[PDB]
Structure prediction request, 438 residues.
Amino acid sequence: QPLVGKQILIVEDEQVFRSLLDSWFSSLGATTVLAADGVDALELLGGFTPDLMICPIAMPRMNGLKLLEHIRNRGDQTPVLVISATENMADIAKALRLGVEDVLLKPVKDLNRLREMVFACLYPSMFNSRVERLFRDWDAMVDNPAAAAKLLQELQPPVQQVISHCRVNYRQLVAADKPGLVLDIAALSENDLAFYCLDVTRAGHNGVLAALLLRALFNGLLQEQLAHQNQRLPELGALLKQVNHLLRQANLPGQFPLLVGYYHRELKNLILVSAGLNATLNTGEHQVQISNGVPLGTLGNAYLNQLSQRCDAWQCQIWGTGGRLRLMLSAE
Amino acid sequence: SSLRKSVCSDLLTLFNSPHSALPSLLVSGMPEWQVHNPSDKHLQSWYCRQLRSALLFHEPRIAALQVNLKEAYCHTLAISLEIMLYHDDEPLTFDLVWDNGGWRSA
Prediction:
């Protein structure tokens, strides 16, 4: 959750779009403050300086460009992202002169799909927010495959840890590349967790970059999904579909073999889905061999139906051409 | 291939049909702005960013896209689309030029 400790001012007169933006940023860990229009936004800025304000141009009482010029003329360096349906280039030129993160354009319907555009726009600043040295910001990573790779290796989980009342162990069993098969495991609450394994050798440099972006946004994507259902019933295939649209929008083409898993320590449910990776699950019940040779980045729609198996302890070999690892979980 | 031909024709329709799904800002706004205003590196990078997003939004068959403004056409706006399609191993480059109203396949 990369935005913990950060405040976002969401200015939006349309309730449907405001609630969407509220969910996306809350799921990344941000504190979100809501404003109905530009005067309400300006009044609220009287009390705090957010790490980001998001606003349209057209809106009641005070438009977005007069609000932007107002805070710029006063001295604020507050980052501003504009999301507008304007048809006037003078609006665009005025916003870029005044200083914005970007001016994004809306669609007629389907505001849901703006999420990838927004996250891909903002993700540089999220990576740089932890660079707190312009040899180590996001652009230097894009332009230096060696630095990118070794940073990714430095970020691998420890081989042994306790997450959500579970002992989680893993071990790399082959050394095919610099980084090869990469892994991340995260608590979703005190009682469940999720993980993914990504082979970064099939897209090369884009694979490392994809892994750094996914490490920052994976948890938040699952949190957003769980937030909209009463029973914590994750749909990992919907996650694969969204990660694929995210990498596409982030300009990270290539092949990304990716396995996603979820485990609830009380319900004892293990859920797996694999796009492009092999896995062998051993429990007390069965041995289960899963295969799928179609990685992310090769289909428009990356949705897959997930597998679920109740169990108390399990171990899982995951391999692709990039390497092989063993992930193990038992009760703490 | 039947695939590369249909994507190209439908891209052309996106840029020319008066009731395109692409934002009017990107089809006519930017060309008409460049005739009356000095060129600006920030506006041009902005234009390529949002045009790329809009095309990806409205053409599901594109897997990767780079949008660049061509230099040699200084008299008018000229765009270069480097596309990669799902299920086609080979890039597709489509070059468009604004003149006499709409856009033309160079």
In short: Residues 205-226 of chain A form the longest helix (22 residues).
